């Protein structure tokens, strides 16, 4: 897709092996915000948004939180609390044509900046002055979209780069996208380090007598700290107590 | 510390960076004290057909700890199947060369990088700047500088 009309592939209910993408040689930019790239396979997310578009090489830096310009303020704005990875690679051998590939477009003008993850696919004439345009291209009345003339002889900063952004959503809901981790046998009545569907900590797991509702995945105490978890393979409710401690 | 890298990779020689040169060739610590001096060396390191003497590590099982050199050539296992030393599917050669050519763009020209790490621990200092010493003055309030 063009950056002004970028594609989103919602990813859910699957195993996400992120070592293949990170250890690949084919990618030039691989910048992660909010998570580290080498801990991705140990994490679980409720949902992954795979966003994809073509931009100009100089604009690759704009695909980051807190950036300004034309692609950030008008084509693909990222939120400042973004969790995800911005993977990008040079695609001159795929996207360039001799006379220029004019299929990839970007929005150049807009009345206001694009809120995070707001797609805008209109072609309404932009009014630069105080005089209404009434749909006619002319003085102070511009066409909001412009094409990148991708040519094989262009410099590196003007060559096409394909960008895939991966947004990792973390809300208190069941996780559906998990890394390629192996599960172990459940051990009860002992102090262990546990990882239940991305939730990590140290404690003693016991059988619970709590009546969890069918939608509840974990529990919390009066203190608003985790004290119970539903096992992701068998729908058993476990109580989590801290490992014994005290003053000496 | 001295090495040759690609121009686009010059930004990776900094604390807190990620990529191939940082995570696999020359990792700097986050509390690094020093200077990263670098210059374009296209007139020295480029050849017409490509100078293939300068190499970089492209693959590795884990990231390089700070100042950890790695000079092995062990085949990298990308999948779940053991490679047993044979180059093939999901079994790669970890090192790759930069094809430095005089017609390459600036981001692909060779840059020579010299990094200078300044160690500061509670021990005698041995490397000092070109300062002149003064006579020692006692029993008076003075601003002093004793070996840093």
């Amino acid at each position: 897709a063009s950056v002004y009309a970028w594609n989103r592939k919602r990813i859910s209910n699957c195993v996400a092996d992120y070592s293949v993408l990170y250890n690949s040689a084919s990618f030039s930019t691989f910048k992660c915000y909010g998570v580290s790239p080498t801990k991705l396979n140990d994490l679980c997310f409720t949902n992954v948004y795979a966003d994809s578009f073509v931009i100009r090489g100089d604009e690759v830096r704009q695909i980051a939180p807190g950036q300004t310009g034309k692609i950030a303020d008008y084509n693909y704005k990222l939120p400042d609390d973004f969790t995800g990875c911005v993977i990008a690679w040079n695609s001159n051998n795929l996207d360039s044509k001799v006379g220029g590939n004019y299929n990839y477009r970007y929005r150049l003008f807009r009345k206001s900046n694009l809120k995070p993850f707001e797609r805008d696919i209109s072609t309404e004439i932009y009014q630069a002055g105080s005089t209404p345009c009434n749909g006619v291209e002319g003085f102070n009345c511009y066409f909001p979209l412009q094409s990148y003339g991708f040519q094989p002889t262009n410099g590196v900063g003007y060559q096409p780069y394909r960008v895939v952004v991966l947004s990792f959503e973390l809300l208190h809901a069941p996780a559906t996208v998990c890394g390629p981790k192996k599960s172990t046998n459940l051990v009860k009545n002992k102090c262990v380090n546990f990882n239940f569907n991305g939730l990590t900590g140290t404690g003693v797991l016991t059988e619970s007598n709590k009546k969890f509702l069918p939608f509840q995945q974990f529990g919390r105490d009066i203190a608003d700290t985790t004290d119970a978890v539903r096992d992701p393979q068998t729908l058993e409710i476990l109580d989590i107590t801290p490992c014994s401690f005290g003053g000496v | 510390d001295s090495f040759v890298i690609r121009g686009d990779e010059v930004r990776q020689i900094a604390p807190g960076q990620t990529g191939k040169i940082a995570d696999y060739n020359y990792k700097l610590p986050d509390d690094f004290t020093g200077c990263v001096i670098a210059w374009n060396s296209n007139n020295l390191d480029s050849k017409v057909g490509g100078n293939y003497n300068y190499r970089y590590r492209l693959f590795r099982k884990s990231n390089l700890k700070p100042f950890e050199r790695d000079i092995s050539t062990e085949i990298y296992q990308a999948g779940s199947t053991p490679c047993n030393g044979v180059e093939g599917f999901n079994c790669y050669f970890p090192l790759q060369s930069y094809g430095f050519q005089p017609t390459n763009g600036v981001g692909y020209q060779p840059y020579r990088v010299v990094v200078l790490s300044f160690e500061l621990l509670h021990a005698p200092a041995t490397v000092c700047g070109p300062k002149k010493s003064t006579n020692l003055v006692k029993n008076k309030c003075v601003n002093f500088n004793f070996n840093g």
Partner: antibody, heavy 122, light 105 residues
Framework: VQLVQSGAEVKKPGASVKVSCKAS????????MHWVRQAPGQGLEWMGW????????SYAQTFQGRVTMTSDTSITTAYMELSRLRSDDTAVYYC??????????????????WGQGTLVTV | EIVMMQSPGTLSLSPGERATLSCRAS???????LAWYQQKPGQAPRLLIY???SRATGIPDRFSGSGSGTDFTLTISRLEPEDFAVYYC?????????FGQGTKV
């Protein structure tokens, strides 16, 4: 990108032949060099490949133990040495470039640039 | 190993018309590993299609490809005198690259 090969060679049965393929316009070590044989009136047959960065090779079972593939990064040139020639080996030999196996997209499955063929008569 | 079979062995048509060539495989083939090449008489083969359907750089839009499984096709929307050449299908699998027998146009 260009791949310029040596001229035609005529050899007697039992001899060995070496065919050079000089590469230009790209990072020679960054790609695998493959050799493809084409007997007259026949289709294309894959012989094997050489990885210039490590001088690593792989050969087709048909030619395993008979052919050696080498390279010289200094002059950006790959070489073919075919030993124990028989009359059935008269063919046009092409050098081709394929991405390495590390390539995320299956660039190793196809040959994107070919040199001019070298005719070998036995 | 896998047998690569092309059809028809010889194609005969006039300039300006459309042509379709087919490539069959003994075993299922991933679309990412199928390619088409054009070899003009007296010239080296050149890549036309890779990844089953993607055109190589520099190739006119008259050439297109499609297919999946064991059945792949190459279509030329309109032929010019330069298009009367030999077309090959190629596939990668195991640790080997296999070519078809070739079709003459």
């Amino acid at each position: 990108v260009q791949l310029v090969q040596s001229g035609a060679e005529v050899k007697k049965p039992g001899a060995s032949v070496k065919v050079s393929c000089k590469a230009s316009g790209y990072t020679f070590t960054g790609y695998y060099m493959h050799w493809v044989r084409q007997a007259p009136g026949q289709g294309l047959e894959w012989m094997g490949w050489i990885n210039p960065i490590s001088s690593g090779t792989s050969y087709a079972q048909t030619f395993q133990g008979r052919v050696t593939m080498t390279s010289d990064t200094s002059i950006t040139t790959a070489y073919m040495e075919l030993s124990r020639l028989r009359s059935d080996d008269t063919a046009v030999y092409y050098c081709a470039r394929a991405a390495p196996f590390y390539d995320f997209w299956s660039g190793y499955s196809y040959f994107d640039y070919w040199g001019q063929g070298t005719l070998v008569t036995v | 190993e896998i047998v690569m079979m092309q059809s028809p062995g010889t194609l005969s048509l006039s300039p300006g018309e459309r042509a379709t060539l087919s490539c069959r495989a003994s075993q299922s083939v991933s679309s990412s590993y199928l390619a088409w090449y054009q070899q003009k008489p007296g010239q080296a083969p050149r890549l036309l299609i890779y990844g089953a359907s993607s055109r190589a750089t520099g190739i006119p839009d008259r050439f297109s490809g499609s297919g999946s499984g064991t059945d792949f096709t190459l279509t030329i929307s309109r032929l010019e005198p330069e298009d009367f050449a030999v077309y090959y299908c190629q596939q990668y699998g195991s640790s080997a690259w296999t070519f078809g027998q070739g079709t003459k146009v």
